[PDB]
Design a protein around this ligand. Structure first.
Ligand SMILES: COC1=C(OC)C(=O)C(C/C=C(\C)CC/C=C(\C)CC/C=C(\C)CC/C=C(\C)CC/C=C(\C)CC/C=C(\C)CC/C=C(\C)CC/C=C(\C)CC/C=C(\C)CCC=C(C)C)=C(C)C1=O
Ligand code: PCD
Ligand code: HEC
Ligand code: HEC
Ligand code: HEC
Ligand code: FES
Ligand code: FES
Lengths: 440, 732, 154
């Protein structure tokens, strides 16, 4: 009371200010591109390709923006956050940044001027990137063409737009700076895979559920989350697909975008194996796959893979062979989807993904199935050279609900979904009619 | 002359003995085909007939699908399976005339009398000397022409064993259809073409446009304008066509148009309402026209009220769903209205097009293209008028009006739901039929589209031949009265249309199911019961040359079926049965005696009915094209199977309920049963084969169901839910 | 706007809205009327084309989805129209009206690429989507089996 409460509040305030406030490194003249060594440029190119630097630092909405120029819109639940320009621009960019300032931003999320960056920039994962990789990718960034584009202004409100207090509190509650620590309990390949997956590649950025404050639930790592309407399925034991995510399946999925059993990488995973993970050394992808196979615990769960595949083959051809005068939802599925989704042989045929094994039918919600039905899969989106028609206008919400209910009842052994029509409408409300086909 | 099928005709003139065939100086022989090529390969069969009669080389035969011209004078009708049957005599006479001219000219060139020279394989010879047809045309240059009455008295060849007829021959149109080179109505491209799409009114008839709001559609790139169709003929009332430079733009513009309508008086009419109106119409004995009314039917029926067996059978609506949606290109070029579309009956729609365009009939010409499946849908021709009106709205510039699947199904002239009541009076022994009373209420497509083609019954009143056909049975049922009643509610609500085997797909259903029910109720064998009434006495004695032998002929095929399937000693496992059903084909004037047997296993739990085997035996006289005949019979049998077990729709709020394949369920490849089709071999006059296969499939299956689980179904299609309901009721 | 892709082995650049279906781009913009328009909702197979050698429905495939891809139509199946599927179709006299037969032939070629020995179950599963209103399925199955046998001979 009085003196005591004032004193303790002042102590807490000065402590929070000392923690949150960071000095601003003096800006340096723009480094010449010739200074950096050629090999460092290639190593930084590999590092930045691994981190998907150009994915969410390029403007996609409206007109396409310049590479690495920022202005990418992120529809955060708290508001809209626009990625900063990381091209070596003198004023609106990192051109005046020094190596120390960029390293500080990578390890702590503090900009050159001392301001704190939002957790939309996943510094909690990039803080594990080693000094050598940081220097390499700084050298790579500083030699990219400069863009004089200014990112648009954020729409985040009070009291979250106040960078100092809000971001300092968020970092205090959840952020833990520090490079990845080598684990002696596992081999070099597993350590490299863990370093990449939890570091540069930040697989848990959208594969781990987040609480109300946007922080990843460390007690539910790789438990699957919801991003952009799609569902990122669990990357651990909790994956509901009947076939285990073996090392070979993981490597195929992460390198070529298609797996022999589970299927192809669509939606938000269209670019990850296609645009980024295919431009990094194959050893890195192999290490990531091995690490996640260890995390997935495939060595114990792989015993039942043959039985699961046989059961899926049995149920894949259900109602697709012989006369079908009884079930009308089965007729709709056969007419609309069964032509390219029927499998008979002991193993699936590449190019005909097995719905009885896919996560779209085994997940808790029909989000992935509805999103695939609506958007479709382009030629280079999932598996290479092959495409999938979009059923935005071919199927109404009722028809999509009928197909989803029939597939869940028949192609899986799980209990039926709930509110399928409302969920179908919600999924449809996130796009803008890919075809002008109509002609219902 | 639009498309010569095997190859283009040589450009060195030709000799035309008549209007049906021409002979080029190089030996090529062109045959003018006026029948629509909707998939039955009619041109190949007609060419076979004319080449066999002409005694010409088949390798020199080409067929031209000619456009509408005054020289053929309303011969462009293709329906009711009349093509081969009607063209038999005409093409035989034409070939005989051409062969006679060739024989005479070859004899003159070779210096011999015509009585000794003989022509074969497109060359006429007299002993050792010989000369081909092309050389004859090049040298003699014949100019003789034959009028139809001149050809009607020529010495035709004997109808026995022929050279080209009843021999396997590849179809002329198949090679083009395999490589995607066949041109349909939807493939037509004209200079300055503008695409168009309609906005369907809420009702088929009596719809009026109040206001149109095109502000939303003006933001669509490529959208030009909208036209509100004013129809002098009143065929497409209340239509609004949106025009664009590209078809997707037209689709989007039509979707974005805001049109206010007066719905009309039939906006809340359901299928049950139509069936109830049919029942009410059939209740009154004075309604309808008696197709034949023998004296004493009432006395026979009412003498013994306790010995009357009556049943009622209903058939639901069926949609064509022809694969190519109805479309047409229209333009006004060189002072003539050109319509490019696939049509089955050009001679019927030409006067309507002329009336709608307010031009003389000689100023309208319809180019002929391959049909993406007619099935009686293209007999309508109501889709050509909106394209012509839209073209007239912009001054005659080409307009390609294409209907989407939803619009095509809304405009579809569906098969009207029908209800038939059959009531017989038996003798004292309850074994023989003494009197018969047949009534059938349905929509009348001929009374709507072609009122001038209505037939006259024994009552002296006009009736639709394509709404009662198949009920004029050949059985010996004593005094028989057959009545056809026109459902005015069906005519007003929608446009009743001709389906494949029109009115012969549901009359045999009721008739054969009723006959089997009566046979089982009187403790009689259905086959023996049917054969005992095939006495072929009276009106069923048969005429010549079409129905030679009368009802006996039908009995023959039935007997053949009873020998093909082992009917006498057929032992089947539990819940398995065999059902038989016979019919005389399409019409009494041109009968195609057919019989069918179905082996059916009925699942007592789910009610699913599976056809293990389907036998068909047909007597269509001479089989001109064995492969074509087999293909047509297979298609017709599968159409009947689909209508009996799979296809079917409903009328909700005055319009068909299903709008695309998401709800409509036609037959697909996995559902095809095992079919065994046999043709009776004889030398009689050929009859139609495209339609008759549909006639007998539906009742037979139903009969088989009664032989499997003992439940009787009197509604088409027979869905598993109905079987489950019947089984649950029988359990009680 | 401008979408560039390889059609029938030739590079083409079509200037059309990215939401335009591949069917109407092929039929109208590229003047290849071999592909046909049926249901329009991807349930009849009349518009089947080959994207990357795999059968797909061009009626509900937007242009933006085939950027830089390889599209094969019925005109590009064989230079002389002597594909094994086409030869089997001609020998068995499968086409009645021929409207579906372009899509049917493309789907049969895709099936033969998938299953070199299509059993009855495989034929039902793969060709179930393709619909023929003329009901030429009896000849379709025989043609598929004959084409498979000829391919195995080869
Ligand atoms: C008074 O107290 C208070 C404070 O304290 C003083 C607080 O701070 C706060 C809490 C405020 C905060 C949460 C801090 C502000 C942070 C934000 C507004 C941002 C929230 C961060 C996220 C939700 C992270 C989302 C980022 C993701 C999903 C990363 C994954 C993305 C990729 C790897 C690829 C990106 C590209 C995509 C998604 C497109 C892919 C292609 C299709 C509160 C409530 C408060 O009460
Ligand atoms: N005898 C004899 C007969 C027949 N044939 C064969 O068969 C066919 C047929 O013929 P005819 O019967 O005559 O028929 P035509 O008339 O031509 O046609 C018509 C029909 O045809 C059918 N079929 C068919 N198919 C197909 N594919 N598609 C179609 O659409 C159709 N349609 C249907 C209908 S219908 Mo009514 O119009 O409805 O009223 S009539 C009808 C021919 O081609 C021939 O070849 C022979 O051989 N023989
Ligand atoms: C999407 C999830 C991102 C990925 C992958 C990477 N970055 Fe990022 N970055 C992102 C956002 C939304 C923001 C803005 C935060 C804010 O406070 O508004 C940033 C910011 C940066 C900065 C700061 C530059 C500035 O002028 O403040 C830098 C230097 C930066 N990001 C670098 C960077 C690198 C090197 C990445 C590859 C490892 C990378 N980012 C990935 C979003 C995302
Ligand atoms: C956000 C953009 C993501 C990042 C970064 C990573 N993943 Fe992901 N992943 C994401 C989505 C939205 C989906 C589902 C889409 C679908 O239709 O497949 C996935 C899917 C996977 C899978 C497939 C699992 C299954 O189908 O059962 C795997 C194995 C996977 N993701 C692994 C993975 C790894 C190893 C990542 C780091 C490199 C990674 N993902 C990043 C979203 C995102
Ligand atoms: C033939 C043209 C198809 C039809 C009709 C349908 N699908 Fe499909 N689907 C097809 C392919 C070739 C692919 C993979 C394409 C690639 O590039 O990734 C897919 C993909 C899916 C998926 C995702 C699985 C994965 O491998 O990513 C799902 C969930 C899916 N398809 C479901 C589905 C449904 C429900 C359909 C009926 C509406 C349907 N597909 C139609 C081929 C074809
Ligand atoms: S039109 Fe594309 S499948 Fe029917
Ligand atoms: S051939 Fe007429 S639709 Fe298949």
């Amino acid at each position: 009371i009085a003196a005591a409460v004032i004193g303790l509040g002042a102590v807490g305030g000065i402590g929070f200010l000392a923690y949150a406030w960071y000095p601003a490194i003096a800006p340096i003249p723009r480094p010449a591109a010739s200074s950096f060594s050629a090999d460092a440029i290639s190593r930084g190119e590999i590092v930045a390709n691994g981190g998907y630097c150009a994915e969410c630092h390029t403007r996609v909405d409206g007109k396409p923006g310049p590479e690495l120029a920022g202005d990418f819109k992120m529809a955060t639940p708290f508001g809209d956050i626009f990625s900063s320009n990381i091209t070596p621009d003198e004023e609106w960019g990192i051109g005046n940044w020094s190596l120390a300032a960029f390293k500080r931003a990578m390890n702590k999320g503090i900009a050159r001027d001392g301001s704190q960056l939002y957790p939309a920039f996943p510094f909690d994962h990039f803080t594990k990137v080693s000094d050598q990789d940081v220097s390499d990718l700084y050298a790579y960034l500083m030699t990219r063409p400069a863009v004089h584009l200014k990112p648009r202004d954020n729409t985040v409100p009070f009291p979250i737009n106040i960078r100092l207090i809000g971001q300092g509190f968020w970092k205090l509650l959840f952020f833990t700076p520090g490079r990845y620590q080598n684990d002696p309990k596992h081999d070099a390949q597993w350590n490299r895979g863990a370093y990449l997956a939890e570091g540069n590649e930040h697989c848990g950025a959208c594969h781990t559920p987040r609480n109300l404050l946007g922080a990843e639930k460390m007690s539910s790592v790789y438990d699957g989350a919801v991003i952009d309407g799609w569902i990122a399925p669990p990357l651990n034991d909790h994956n509901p697909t009947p076939v285990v995510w073996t090392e070979d399946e993981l490597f195929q999925y992460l390198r070529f975008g298609v797996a022999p059993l589970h299927g192809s990488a669509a939606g938000p995973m269209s670019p990850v194996p296609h645009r980024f993970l295919s431009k990094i050394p194959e050893e890195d992808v192999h290490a990531i796959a091995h690490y996640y196979a260890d995390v997935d615990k495939a060595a114990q769960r792989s015993s039942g893979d043959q039985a699961a595949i046989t059961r899926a083959m049995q149920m894949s051809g259900r109602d697709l062979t012989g006369p079908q005068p009884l079930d009308e939802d089965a007729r709709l599925y056969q007419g609309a989807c069964g032509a390219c989704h029927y499998n008979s042989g002991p193993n699936p045929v590449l190019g005909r993904p097995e719905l009885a094994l896919n996560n779209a039918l085994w997940l808790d919600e029909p989000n992935n199935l509805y999103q695939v039905m609506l958007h479709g899969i382009t030629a280079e989106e999932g598996q290479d050279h092959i495409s999938m028609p979009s059923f935005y206008s071919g199927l109404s919400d009722h028809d999509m609900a009928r197909i989803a209910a029939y597939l869940r009842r028949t192609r899986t052994t799980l209990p039926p979904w709930t509110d399928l029509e409302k969920k179908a409408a919600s999924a449809r409300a996130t796009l803008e009619a890919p075809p002008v086909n109509a002609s219902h | 002359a639009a498309t010569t099928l095997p190859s283009a005709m040589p450009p060195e003139a030709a000799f035309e003995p008549n209007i049906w065939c021409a002979i080029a100086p190089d030996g090529s022989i062109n045959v003018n085909i006026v029948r629509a090529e909707m998939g039955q390969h009619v041109g190949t069969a007609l060419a076979r007939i004319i080449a066999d009669e002409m005694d010409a080389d088949w390798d020199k035969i080409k067929i031209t699908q000619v456009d509408t011209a005054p020289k053929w004078a309303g011969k462009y009708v293709t329906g009711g399976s009349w093509s081969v049957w009607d063209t038999w005599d005409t093409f035989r006479q034409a070939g005989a005339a051409a062969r006679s001219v060739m024989i005479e000219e070859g004899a003159k060139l070779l210096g011999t009398t015509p009585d000794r020279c003989t022509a074969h394989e497109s060359v006429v010879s007299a002993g050792s000397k010989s000369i081909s047809f092309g050389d004859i045309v090049a040298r003699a240059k014949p100019t003789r022409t034959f009028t139809p009455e001149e050809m009607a008295k020529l010495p035709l060849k004997p109808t026995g064993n022929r050279r080209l007829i009843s021999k396997q021959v590849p179809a002329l149109d198949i090679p083009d259809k395999t490589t995607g080179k066949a041109i349909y109505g939807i493939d037509v491209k004209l200079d300055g073409m503008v695409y168009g799409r309609p906005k369907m009114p809420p009702t088929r008839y009596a719809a009026k446009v109040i206001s149109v709001d095109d502000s939303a559609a003006k933001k669509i790139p490529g959208y030009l304008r909208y036209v509100v169709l004013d129809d002098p003929s009143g065929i497409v009332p209340g239509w609004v066509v949106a025009l664009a430079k590209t078809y997707p733009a037209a689709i989007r513009a039509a979707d974005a148009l805001k049109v206010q309508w007066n719905p009309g008086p039939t906006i809340n009419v359901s299928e049950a309402d139509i069936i109830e109106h049919g029942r009410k119409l059939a209740a009154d004995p004075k309604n309808g026209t008696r197709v034949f009314n023998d004296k004493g039917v009432d006395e026979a029926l009412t003498i013994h009220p306790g010995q009357v067996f009556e049943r009622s059978y209903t058939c639901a609506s069926v949609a064509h769903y022809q694969l190519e949606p109805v479309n047409a290109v229209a333009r006004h070029i060189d002072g003539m209205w050109e319509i490019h579309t696939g049509n089955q009956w050009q001679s019927l729609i030409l006067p309507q097009l002329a009336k709608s365009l307010q031009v003389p009939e000689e100023q309208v010409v319809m180019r002929t293209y391959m049909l993406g499946g007619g099935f009686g849908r293209r007999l309508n021709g109501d889709y050509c008028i909106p394209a012509a009106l839209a073209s007239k709205a912009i001054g005659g510039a080409p307009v390609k009006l294409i209907l989407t699947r939803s619009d095509d199904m809304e405009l579809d002239s569906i098969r009207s739901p029908s209800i038939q009541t059959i009531k017989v009076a038996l003798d004292n022994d309850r074994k023989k039929i003494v009197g018969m009373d047949y009534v059938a209420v349905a929509g009348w497509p001929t009374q709507v589209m072609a009122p001038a083609f209505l037939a006259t019954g024994e009552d002296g009143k006009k009736y639709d031949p394509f709404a009662i056909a198949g009920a004029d049975h050949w059985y010996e049922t004593g005094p028989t009265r057959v009545r056809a009643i026109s459902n005015d509610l069906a005519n007003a609500t929608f446009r009743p249309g001709w389906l494949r085997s029109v009115s012969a797909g549901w009359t045999p259903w009721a008739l054969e199911c009723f006959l089997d029910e009566l046979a089982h109720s009187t403790k009689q064998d259905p086959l023996a019961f049917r054969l005992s009434m095939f006495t072929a006495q009276g009106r069923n004695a048969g005429q010549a040359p079409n129905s030679v032998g009368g009802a006996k002929r039908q009995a023959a095929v039935l007997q053949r079926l009873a020998d093909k399937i082992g009917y006498a000693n057929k032992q089947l496992p539990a819940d398995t049965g065999i059902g038989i059903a016979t019919s005389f084909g399409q019409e009494r004037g041109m009968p195609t005696w057919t019989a069918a047997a179905a082996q059916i296993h009925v699942d007592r739990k789910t009610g699913v009915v599976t056809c293990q085997k389907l036998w068909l035996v047909l007597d269509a006289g001479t089989i001109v094209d064995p492969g074509g005949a087999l293909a047509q019979t297979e298609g017709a049998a599968l159409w009947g199977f689909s209508m009996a077990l799979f296809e079917g729709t409903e009328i909700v709020n005055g319009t068909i309920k299903d709008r695309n394949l998401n709800t409509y369920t036609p037959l697909r490849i996995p559902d095809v049963p095992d079919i065994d089709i046999e043709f009776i071999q004889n030398t009689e006059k050929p009859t139609g084969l495209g339609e008759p296969g549909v006639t007998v499939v539906a009742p037979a299956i139903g009969n088989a169901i009664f032989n499997a689980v003992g439940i009787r179904l009197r509604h088409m299609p027979m869905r598993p839910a109905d079987v489950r309901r019947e089984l649950q009721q029988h359990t009680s | 706007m401008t979408t560039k892709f390889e059609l029938n082995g030739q590079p083409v650049t079509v200037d059309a809205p990215a939401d335009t279906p591949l069917l109407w781009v092929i039929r109208d913009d590229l003047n290849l009327t071999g592909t046909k328009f049926g249901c329009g909702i991807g349930e009849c197979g009349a518009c089947t084309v080959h994207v990357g050698g795999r059968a797909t429905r061009s009626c509900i495939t937007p242009l933006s989805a085939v950027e830089g891809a390889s599209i094969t139509t019925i005109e590009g199946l064989d230079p002389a129209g002597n594909h094994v599927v086409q030869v089997a179709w001609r020998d068995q006299q499968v086409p009645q009206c021929g409207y579906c037969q372009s899509g049917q032939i493309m789907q049969a070629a895709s099936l033969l690429k998938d299953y070199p020995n299509p059993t009855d179950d495989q034929i039902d599963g793969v060709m179930g989507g393709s619909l023929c209103r003329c009901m030429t399925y009896i000849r379709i199955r025989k043609a598929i089996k004959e084409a498979a046998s000829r391919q195995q001979e080869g």
